[PDB]
Tab-separated table of C-alpha atoms and ligand atoms in Angstrom:
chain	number	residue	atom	x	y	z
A	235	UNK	CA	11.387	5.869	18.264
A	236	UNK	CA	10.868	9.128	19.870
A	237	UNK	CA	7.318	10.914	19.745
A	238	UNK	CA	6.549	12.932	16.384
A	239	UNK	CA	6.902	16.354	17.004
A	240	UNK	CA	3.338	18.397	18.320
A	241	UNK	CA	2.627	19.667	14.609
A	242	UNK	CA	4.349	18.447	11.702
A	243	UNK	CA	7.322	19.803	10.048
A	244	UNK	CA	6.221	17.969	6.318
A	245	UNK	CA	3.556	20.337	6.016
A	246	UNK	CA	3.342	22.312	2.817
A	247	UNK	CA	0.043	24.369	3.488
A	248	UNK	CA	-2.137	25.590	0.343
A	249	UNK	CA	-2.520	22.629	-2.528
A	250	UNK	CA	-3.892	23.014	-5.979
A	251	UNK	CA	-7.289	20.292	-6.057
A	252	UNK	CA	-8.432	19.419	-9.124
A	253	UNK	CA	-11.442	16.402	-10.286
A	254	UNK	CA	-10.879	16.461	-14.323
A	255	UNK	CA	-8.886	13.892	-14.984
A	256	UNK	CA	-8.955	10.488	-14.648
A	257	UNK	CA	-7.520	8.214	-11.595
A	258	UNK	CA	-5.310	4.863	-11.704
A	259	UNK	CA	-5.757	3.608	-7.783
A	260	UNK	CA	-2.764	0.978	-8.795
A	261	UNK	CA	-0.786	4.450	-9.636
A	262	UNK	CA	-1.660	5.665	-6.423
A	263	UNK	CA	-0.603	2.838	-4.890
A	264	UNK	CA	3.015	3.402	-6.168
A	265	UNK	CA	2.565	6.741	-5.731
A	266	UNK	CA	2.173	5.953	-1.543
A	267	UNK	CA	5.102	2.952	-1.069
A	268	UNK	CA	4.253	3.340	2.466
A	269	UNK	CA	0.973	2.711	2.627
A	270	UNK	CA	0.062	-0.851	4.230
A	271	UNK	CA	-2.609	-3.431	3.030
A	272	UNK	CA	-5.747	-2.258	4.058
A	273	UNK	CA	-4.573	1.703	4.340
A	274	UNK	CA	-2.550	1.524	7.050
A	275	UNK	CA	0.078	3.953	7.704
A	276	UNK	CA	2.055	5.330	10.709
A	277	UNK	CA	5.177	6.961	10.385
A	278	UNK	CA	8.755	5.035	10.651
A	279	UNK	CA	10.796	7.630	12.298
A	280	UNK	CA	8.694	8.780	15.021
A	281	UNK	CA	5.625	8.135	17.516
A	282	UNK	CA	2.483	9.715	16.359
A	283	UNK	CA	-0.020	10.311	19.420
A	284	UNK	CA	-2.717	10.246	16.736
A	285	UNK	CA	-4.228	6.547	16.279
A	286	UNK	CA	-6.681	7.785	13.706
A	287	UNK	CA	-9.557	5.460	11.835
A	288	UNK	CA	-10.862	7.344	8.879
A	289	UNK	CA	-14.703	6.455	8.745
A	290	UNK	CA	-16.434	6.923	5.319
A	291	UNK	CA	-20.379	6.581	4.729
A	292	UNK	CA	-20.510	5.055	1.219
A	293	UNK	CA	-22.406	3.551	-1.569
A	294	UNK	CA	-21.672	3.758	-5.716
A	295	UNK	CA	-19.275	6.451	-5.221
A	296	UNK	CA	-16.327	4.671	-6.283
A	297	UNK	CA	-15.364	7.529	-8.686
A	298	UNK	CA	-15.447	10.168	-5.854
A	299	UNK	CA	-13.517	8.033	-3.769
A	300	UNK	CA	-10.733	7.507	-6.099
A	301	UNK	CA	-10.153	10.909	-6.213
A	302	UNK	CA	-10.571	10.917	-2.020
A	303	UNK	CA	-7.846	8.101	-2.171
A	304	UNK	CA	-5.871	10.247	-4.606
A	305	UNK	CA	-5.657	13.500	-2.334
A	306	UNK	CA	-5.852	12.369	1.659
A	307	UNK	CA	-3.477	9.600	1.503
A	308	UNK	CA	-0.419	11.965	0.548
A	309	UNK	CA	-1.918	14.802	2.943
A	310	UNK	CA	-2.454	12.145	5.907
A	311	UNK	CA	1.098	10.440	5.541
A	312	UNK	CA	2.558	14.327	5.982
A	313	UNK	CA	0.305	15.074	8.807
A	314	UNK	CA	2.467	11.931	10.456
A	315	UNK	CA	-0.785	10.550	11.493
A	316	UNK	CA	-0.655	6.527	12.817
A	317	UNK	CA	-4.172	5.787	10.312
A	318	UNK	CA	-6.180	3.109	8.641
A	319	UNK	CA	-8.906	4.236	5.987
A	320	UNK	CA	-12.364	2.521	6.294
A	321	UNK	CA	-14.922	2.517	3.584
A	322	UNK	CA	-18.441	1.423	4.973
A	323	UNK	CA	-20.305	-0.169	2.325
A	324	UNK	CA	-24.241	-0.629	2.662
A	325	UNK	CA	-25.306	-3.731	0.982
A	326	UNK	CA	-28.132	-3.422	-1.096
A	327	UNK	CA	-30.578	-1.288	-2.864
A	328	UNK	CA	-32.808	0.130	-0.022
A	329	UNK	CA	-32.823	3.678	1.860
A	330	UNK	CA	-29.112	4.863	2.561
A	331	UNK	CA	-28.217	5.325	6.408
A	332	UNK	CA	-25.048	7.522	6.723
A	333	UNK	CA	-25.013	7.797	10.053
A	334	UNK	CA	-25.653	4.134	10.904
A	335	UNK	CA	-22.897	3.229	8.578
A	336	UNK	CA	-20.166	5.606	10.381
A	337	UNK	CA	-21.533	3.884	13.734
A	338	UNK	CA	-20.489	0.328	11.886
A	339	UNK	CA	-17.255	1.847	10.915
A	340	UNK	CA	-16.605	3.323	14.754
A	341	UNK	CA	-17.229	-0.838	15.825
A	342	UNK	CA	-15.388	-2.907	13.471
A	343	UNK	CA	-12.130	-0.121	12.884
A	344	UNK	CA	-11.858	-0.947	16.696
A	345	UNK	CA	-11.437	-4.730	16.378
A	346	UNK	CA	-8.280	-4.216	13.899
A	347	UNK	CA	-6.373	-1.491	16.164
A	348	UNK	CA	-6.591	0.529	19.167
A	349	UNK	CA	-7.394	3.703	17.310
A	350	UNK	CA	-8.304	6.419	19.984
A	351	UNK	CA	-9.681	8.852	17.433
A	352	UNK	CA	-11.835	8.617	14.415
A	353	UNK	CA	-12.742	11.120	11.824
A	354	UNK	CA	-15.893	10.976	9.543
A	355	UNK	CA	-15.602	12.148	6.157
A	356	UNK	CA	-17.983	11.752	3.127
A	357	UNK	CA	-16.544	10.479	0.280
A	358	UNK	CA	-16.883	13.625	-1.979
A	359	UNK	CA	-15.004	16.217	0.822
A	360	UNK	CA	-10.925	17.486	-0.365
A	361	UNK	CA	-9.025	19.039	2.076
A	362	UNK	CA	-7.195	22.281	0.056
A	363	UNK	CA	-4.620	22.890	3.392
A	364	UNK	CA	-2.606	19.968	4.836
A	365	UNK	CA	-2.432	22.198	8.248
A	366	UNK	CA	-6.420	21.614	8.705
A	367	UNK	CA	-5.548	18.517	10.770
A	368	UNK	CA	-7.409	14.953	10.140
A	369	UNK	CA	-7.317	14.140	14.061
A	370	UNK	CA	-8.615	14.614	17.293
A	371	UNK	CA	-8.384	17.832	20.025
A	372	UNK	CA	-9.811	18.354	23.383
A	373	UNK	CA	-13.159	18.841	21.978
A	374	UNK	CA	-15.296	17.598	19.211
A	375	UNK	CA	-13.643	18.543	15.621
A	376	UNK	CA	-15.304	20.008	13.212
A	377	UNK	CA	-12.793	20.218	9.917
A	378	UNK	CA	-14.432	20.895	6.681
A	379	UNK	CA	-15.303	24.254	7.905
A	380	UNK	CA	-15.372	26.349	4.653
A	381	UNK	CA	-16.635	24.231	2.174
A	382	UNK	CA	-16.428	25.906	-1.875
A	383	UNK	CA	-20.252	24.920	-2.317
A	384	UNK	CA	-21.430	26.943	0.863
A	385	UNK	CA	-19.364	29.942	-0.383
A	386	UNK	CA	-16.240	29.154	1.562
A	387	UNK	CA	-17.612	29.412	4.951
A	388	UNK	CA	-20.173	27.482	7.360
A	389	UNK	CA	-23.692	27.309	6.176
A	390	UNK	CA	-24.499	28.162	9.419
A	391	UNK	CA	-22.572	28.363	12.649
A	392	UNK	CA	-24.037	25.083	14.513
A	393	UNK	CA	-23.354	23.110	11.055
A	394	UNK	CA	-21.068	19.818	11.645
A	395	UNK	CA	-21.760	17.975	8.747
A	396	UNK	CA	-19.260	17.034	6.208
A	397	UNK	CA	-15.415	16.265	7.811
A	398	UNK	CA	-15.169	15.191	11.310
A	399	UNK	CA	-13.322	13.806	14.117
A	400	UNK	CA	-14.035	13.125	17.582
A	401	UNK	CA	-12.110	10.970	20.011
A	402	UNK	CA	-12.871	7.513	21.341
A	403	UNK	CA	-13.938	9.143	24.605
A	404	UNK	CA	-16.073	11.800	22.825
A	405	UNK	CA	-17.888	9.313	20.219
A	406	UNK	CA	-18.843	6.816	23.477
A	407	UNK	CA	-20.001	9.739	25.582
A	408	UNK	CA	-23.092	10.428	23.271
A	409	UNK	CA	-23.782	6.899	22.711
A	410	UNK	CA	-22.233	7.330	19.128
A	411	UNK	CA	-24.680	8.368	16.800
A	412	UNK	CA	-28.019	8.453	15.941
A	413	UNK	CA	-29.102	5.146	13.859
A	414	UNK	CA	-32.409	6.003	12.464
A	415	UNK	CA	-31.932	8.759	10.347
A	416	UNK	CA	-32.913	7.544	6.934
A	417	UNK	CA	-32.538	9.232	3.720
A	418	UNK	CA	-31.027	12.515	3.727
A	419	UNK	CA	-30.393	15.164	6.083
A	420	UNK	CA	-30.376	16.133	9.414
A	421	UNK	CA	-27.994	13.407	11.163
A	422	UNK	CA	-25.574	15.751	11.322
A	423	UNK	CA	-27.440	18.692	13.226
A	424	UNK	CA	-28.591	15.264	15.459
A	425	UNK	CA	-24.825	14.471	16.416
A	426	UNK	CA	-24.579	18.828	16.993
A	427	UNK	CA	-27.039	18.359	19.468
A	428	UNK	CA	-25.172	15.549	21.158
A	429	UNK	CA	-22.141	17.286	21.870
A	430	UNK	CA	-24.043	19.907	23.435
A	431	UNK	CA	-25.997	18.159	25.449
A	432	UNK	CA	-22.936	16.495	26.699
A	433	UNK	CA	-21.253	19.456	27.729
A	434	UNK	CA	-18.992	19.815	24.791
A	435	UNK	CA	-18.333	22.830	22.005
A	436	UNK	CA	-16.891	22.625	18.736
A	437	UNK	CA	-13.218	23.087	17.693
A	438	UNK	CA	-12.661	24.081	14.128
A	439	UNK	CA	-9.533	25.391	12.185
A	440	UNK	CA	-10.091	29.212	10.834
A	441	UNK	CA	-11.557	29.187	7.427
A	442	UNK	CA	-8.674	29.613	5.069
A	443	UNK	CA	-6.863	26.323	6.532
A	444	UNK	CA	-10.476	24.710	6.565
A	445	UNK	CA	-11.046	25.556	2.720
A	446	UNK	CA	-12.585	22.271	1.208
A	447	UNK	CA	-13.797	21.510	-1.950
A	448	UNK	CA	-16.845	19.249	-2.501
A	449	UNK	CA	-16.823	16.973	-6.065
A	450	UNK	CA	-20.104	18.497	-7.835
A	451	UNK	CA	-22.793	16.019	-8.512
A	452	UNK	CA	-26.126	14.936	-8.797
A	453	UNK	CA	-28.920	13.753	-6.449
A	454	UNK	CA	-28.035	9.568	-5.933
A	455	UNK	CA	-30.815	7.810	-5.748
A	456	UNK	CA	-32.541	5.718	-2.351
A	457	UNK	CA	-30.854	8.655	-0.349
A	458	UNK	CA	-34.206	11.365	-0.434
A	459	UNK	CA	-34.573	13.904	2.271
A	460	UNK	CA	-36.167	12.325	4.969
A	461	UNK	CA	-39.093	14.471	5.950
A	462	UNK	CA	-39.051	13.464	9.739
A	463	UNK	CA	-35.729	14.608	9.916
A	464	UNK	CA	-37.108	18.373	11.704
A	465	UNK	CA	-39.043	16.435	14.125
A	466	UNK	CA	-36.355	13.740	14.770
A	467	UNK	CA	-33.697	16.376	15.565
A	468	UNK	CA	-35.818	18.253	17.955
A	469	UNK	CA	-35.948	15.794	20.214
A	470	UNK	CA	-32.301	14.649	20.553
A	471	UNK	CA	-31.705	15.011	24.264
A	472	UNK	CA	-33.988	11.891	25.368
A	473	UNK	CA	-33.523	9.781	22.015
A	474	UNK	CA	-29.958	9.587	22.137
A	475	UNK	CA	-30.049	8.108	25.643
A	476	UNK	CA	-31.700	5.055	24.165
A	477	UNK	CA	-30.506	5.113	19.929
A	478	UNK	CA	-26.903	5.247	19.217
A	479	UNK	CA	-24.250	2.273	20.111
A	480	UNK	CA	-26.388	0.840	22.843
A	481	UNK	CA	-29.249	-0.319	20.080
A	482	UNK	CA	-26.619	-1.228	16.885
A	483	UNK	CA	-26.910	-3.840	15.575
A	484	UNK	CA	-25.609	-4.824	12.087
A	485	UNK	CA	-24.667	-7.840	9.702
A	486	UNK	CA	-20.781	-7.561	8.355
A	487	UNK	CA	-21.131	-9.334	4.778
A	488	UNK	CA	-17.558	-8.834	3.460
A	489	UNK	CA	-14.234	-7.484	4.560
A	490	UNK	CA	-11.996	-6.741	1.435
A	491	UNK	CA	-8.475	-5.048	2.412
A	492	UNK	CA	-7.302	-3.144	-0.795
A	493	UNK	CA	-4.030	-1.855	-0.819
A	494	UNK	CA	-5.635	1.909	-0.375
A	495	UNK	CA	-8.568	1.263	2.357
A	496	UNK	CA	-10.638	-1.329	3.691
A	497	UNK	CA	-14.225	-1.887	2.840
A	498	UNK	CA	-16.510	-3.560	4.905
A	499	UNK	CA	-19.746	-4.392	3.419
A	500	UNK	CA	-22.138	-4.584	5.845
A	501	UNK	CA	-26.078	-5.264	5.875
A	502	UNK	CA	-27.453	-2.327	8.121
A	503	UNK	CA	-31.037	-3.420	7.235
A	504	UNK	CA	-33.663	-1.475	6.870
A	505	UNK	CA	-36.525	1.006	9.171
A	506	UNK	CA	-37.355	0.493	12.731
B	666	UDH	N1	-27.967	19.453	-7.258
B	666	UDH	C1	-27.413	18.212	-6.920
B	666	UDH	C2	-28.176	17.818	-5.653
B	666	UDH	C3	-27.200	16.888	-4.914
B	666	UDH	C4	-27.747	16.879	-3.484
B	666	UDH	C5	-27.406	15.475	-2.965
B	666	UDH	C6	-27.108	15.711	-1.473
B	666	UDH	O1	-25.711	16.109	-1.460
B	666	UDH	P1	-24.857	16.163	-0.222
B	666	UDH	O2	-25.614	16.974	0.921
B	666	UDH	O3	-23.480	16.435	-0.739
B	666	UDH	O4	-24.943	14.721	0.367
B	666	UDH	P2	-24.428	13.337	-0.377
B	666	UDH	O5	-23.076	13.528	-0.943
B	666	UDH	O6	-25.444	12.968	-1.383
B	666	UDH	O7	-24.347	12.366	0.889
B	666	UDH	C7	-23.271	12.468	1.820
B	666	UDH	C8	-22.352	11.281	1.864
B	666	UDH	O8	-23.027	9.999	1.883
B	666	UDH	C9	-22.309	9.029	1.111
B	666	UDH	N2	-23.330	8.489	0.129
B	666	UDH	C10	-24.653	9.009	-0.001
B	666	UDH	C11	-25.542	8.521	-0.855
B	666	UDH	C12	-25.192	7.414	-1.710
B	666	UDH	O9	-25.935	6.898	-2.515
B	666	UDH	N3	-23.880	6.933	-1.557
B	666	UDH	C13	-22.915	7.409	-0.677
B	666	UDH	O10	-21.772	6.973	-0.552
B	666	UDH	C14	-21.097	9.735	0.601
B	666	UDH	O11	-19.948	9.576	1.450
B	666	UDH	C15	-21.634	11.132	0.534
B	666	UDH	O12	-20.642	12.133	0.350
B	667	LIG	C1	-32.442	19.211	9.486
B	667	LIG	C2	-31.713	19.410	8.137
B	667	LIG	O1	-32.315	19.301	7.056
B	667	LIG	N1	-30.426	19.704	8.244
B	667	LIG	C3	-29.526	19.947	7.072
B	667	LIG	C4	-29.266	21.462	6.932
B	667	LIG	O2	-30.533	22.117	6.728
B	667	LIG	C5	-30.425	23.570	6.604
B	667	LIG	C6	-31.715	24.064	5.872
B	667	LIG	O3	-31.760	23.466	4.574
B	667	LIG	C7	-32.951	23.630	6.702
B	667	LIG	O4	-34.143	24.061	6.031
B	667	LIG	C8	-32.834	24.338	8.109
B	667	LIG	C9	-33.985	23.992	9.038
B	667	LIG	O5	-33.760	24.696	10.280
B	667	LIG	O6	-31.602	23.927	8.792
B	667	LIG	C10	-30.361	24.210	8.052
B	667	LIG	O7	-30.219	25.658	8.032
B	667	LIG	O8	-28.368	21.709	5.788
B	667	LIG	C11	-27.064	21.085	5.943
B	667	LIG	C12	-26.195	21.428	4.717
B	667	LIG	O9	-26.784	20.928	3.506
B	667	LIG	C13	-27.272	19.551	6.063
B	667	LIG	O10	-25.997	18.943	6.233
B	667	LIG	C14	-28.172	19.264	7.290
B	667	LIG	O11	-28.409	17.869	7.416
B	668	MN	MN1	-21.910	15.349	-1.521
């Protein structure tokens, strides 16, 4: 097979998003033939130089990512991306970890393929352009760039929370990222500071191709602002040497491969 061209030719640009009505994942399924158990895709007639893992933080939010299953899978089969789709569960009931969860997802995704690039997405984030690209460049990407519930452009311009890819080689440069951001808020600016501090910038598309539209809803519960979250950022430079990959640790409790994505439930404990 020869390599997939640089950008894709199946690209249709602007799509129409909507989260009214109601979503039958076995519909889906038929929907995407050539989607493999598990989520696995890569395209027949050509090479793709993108070995992407989709990483997504989640917990109860099987609604929202019905409708996430609904929208990427069509967009990432077009962007002739070679992907698998991870959903990282947290067992249990106590304080949700988002970041700890994507570190899980970084981990295991690289025991089932030699992905090279990973992108983090929440489970509530649409893509409205199939030309905002769900892979890696030469720098850090930052994709959900102009969001509809920040008024269609960054909240502010060091904000990298939301979509996201970075390579294999950028994720293990800043020891991953931080695990002990509990409760809401913060991570995100955490893994901005990173980058920096490892000599990198971030890449985004321009804001029409990064429109994205966020599924309204309410506060979920076990997931409240954590109120160390200023101090913890501030002092990113010398944690991160020391909290990241090189202090995970994690119990996998189930592996499920669904014909759309594969969730691994995993126990990521609980503070300190
Ligand atoms: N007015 C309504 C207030 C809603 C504010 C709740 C915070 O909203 P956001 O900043 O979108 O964050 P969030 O969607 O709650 O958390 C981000 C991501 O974590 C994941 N997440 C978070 C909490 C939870 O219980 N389950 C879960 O899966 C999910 O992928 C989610 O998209
Ligand atoms: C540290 C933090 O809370 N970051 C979140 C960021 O916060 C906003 C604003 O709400 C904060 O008061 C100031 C403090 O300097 O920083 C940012 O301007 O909001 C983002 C979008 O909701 C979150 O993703 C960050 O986690
Ligand atoms: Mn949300």
């Amino acid at each position: 097979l020869p390599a997939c061209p640089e950008e894709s030719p199946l690209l249709v640009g602007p799509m129409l998003i909507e989260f009214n009505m109601p979503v039958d994942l076995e519909l889906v399924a038929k929907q995407n033939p050539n989607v493999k158990m598990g989520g696995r895709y890569a395209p027949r007639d050509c090479v793709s130089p993108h070995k992407v893992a989709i990483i997504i933080p989640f917990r109860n939010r099987q609604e929202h990512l019905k409708y996430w299953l609904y929208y990427l899978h069509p967009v990432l089969q077009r962007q002739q991306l070679d992907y698998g789709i991870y959903v990282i569960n947290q067992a249990g009931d106590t304080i949700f970890n988002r970041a700890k969860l994507l570190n899980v997802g970084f981990q295991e995704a690289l025991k089932d393929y030699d992905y090279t690039c990973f992108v983090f997405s929440d489970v509530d984030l649409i893509p409205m352009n199939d030309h905002n690209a769900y892979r890696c460049f030469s720098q850090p990407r930052h994709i959900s760039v102009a969001m509809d519930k920040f008024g269609f452009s960054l909240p502010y311009v060091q904000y990298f929370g939301g979509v996201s890819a970075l390579s294999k080689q950028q994720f293990l440069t800043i020891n991953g990222f931080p695990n002990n951001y509990w409760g809401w808020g913060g991570e995100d600016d955490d893994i901005f500071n990173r980058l920096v501090f490892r000599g990198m910038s971030i890449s985004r598309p321009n804001a029409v191709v990064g429109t994205t539209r966020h599924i309204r809803h309410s506060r979920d519960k076990k997931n409240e602002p954590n109120p160390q979250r200023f101090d913890r950022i501030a002092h990113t430079k010398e944690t991160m040497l020391s909290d990241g990959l090189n202090s995970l640790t994690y119990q996998v409790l189930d592996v499920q491969r669904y014909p759309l994505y594969t969730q691994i439930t995993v126990d990521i404990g609980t503070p300190s």
